[PDB]
């Protein structure tokens, strides 16, 4: 169908780009995910007025989502923000494994290719130490301090 995006920026289409799209991408990815809202010559008018608010006020702690996204598409340097990516560097214990929650791409992951650790990892500040496996049953490690602002 067609939508006006709600998305700040998206790899094609950005920042209240009203465009038509594939039906199979649009209804099951651009919506329902908040990255678009349907377009109609009714909707566009509503939306045009709305987006001076919505694609600004919502879209301002969302800068994080585009950045952190790389880190979870690879799962080499598994990095998400729990509160961060919009507050400076990714810091505190907060982030991935301290609640054992990190977003996956499709449940096929390299972020639980072994489990072994006694209280997880992360415990520095102003940077955040992830464990970056070197095997699948030994945890000799190569820990990094990546951020994804």
């Amino acid at each position: 169908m067609q939508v006006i995006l709600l998305d700040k920026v998206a790899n094609l289409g950005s920042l209240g780009d009203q465009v038509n799209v594939k039906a199979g991408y649009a209804r099951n990815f651009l919506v329902p995910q908040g990255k678009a809202v349907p377009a109609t010559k009714k909707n566009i008018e509503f939306f045009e007025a709305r987006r001076a608010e919505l694609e600004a006020k919502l879209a301002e702690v969302l800068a994080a989502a585009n950045a952190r996204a790389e880190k979870i598409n690879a799962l080499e340097t598994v990095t998400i923000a729990s509160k961060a990516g919009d507050e400076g560097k990714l810091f505190g214990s907060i982030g991935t494994r301290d609640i054992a929650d990190a977003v996956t791409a499709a449940g096929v992951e390299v972020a639980k290719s072994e489990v072994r650790l006694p209280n997880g990892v992360l415990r520095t500040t102003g940077e955040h130490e992830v464990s970056f496996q070197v095997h699948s049953e030994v945890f000799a490690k190569v820990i990094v301090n990546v951020v994804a602002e």
Partner: protein
């Protein structure tokens, strides 16, 4: 079944046909598939069996408008 629940479907009467123009009959199934629609207005999926003309139709009018009906068509939501 084999019905859209919207557009209104069921297989409907046919025949093989030949330039011979022989006599036999066969019906004809529409293109329906049960597709997992996202209600959003209770933010769940209420997977309905739907046509593929209809799939379009649902889209153009929007989720809770097909789902406005069903209730108004007196039938399983």
């Amino acid at each position: 079944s084999r019905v859209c629940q919207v557009t209104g479907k069921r297989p409907v009467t046919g025949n093989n046909r030949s330039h011979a123009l022989n006599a036999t009959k066969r019906r004809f199934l529409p293109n329906l598939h049960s597709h997992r629609f996202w209600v959003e207005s209770e933010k769940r999926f209420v997977t309905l069996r739907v046509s593929a003309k209809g799939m379009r139709v649902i889209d153009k009018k929007g989720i809770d408008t097909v789902l406005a009906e069903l209730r108004a068509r007196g039938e399983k939501y």
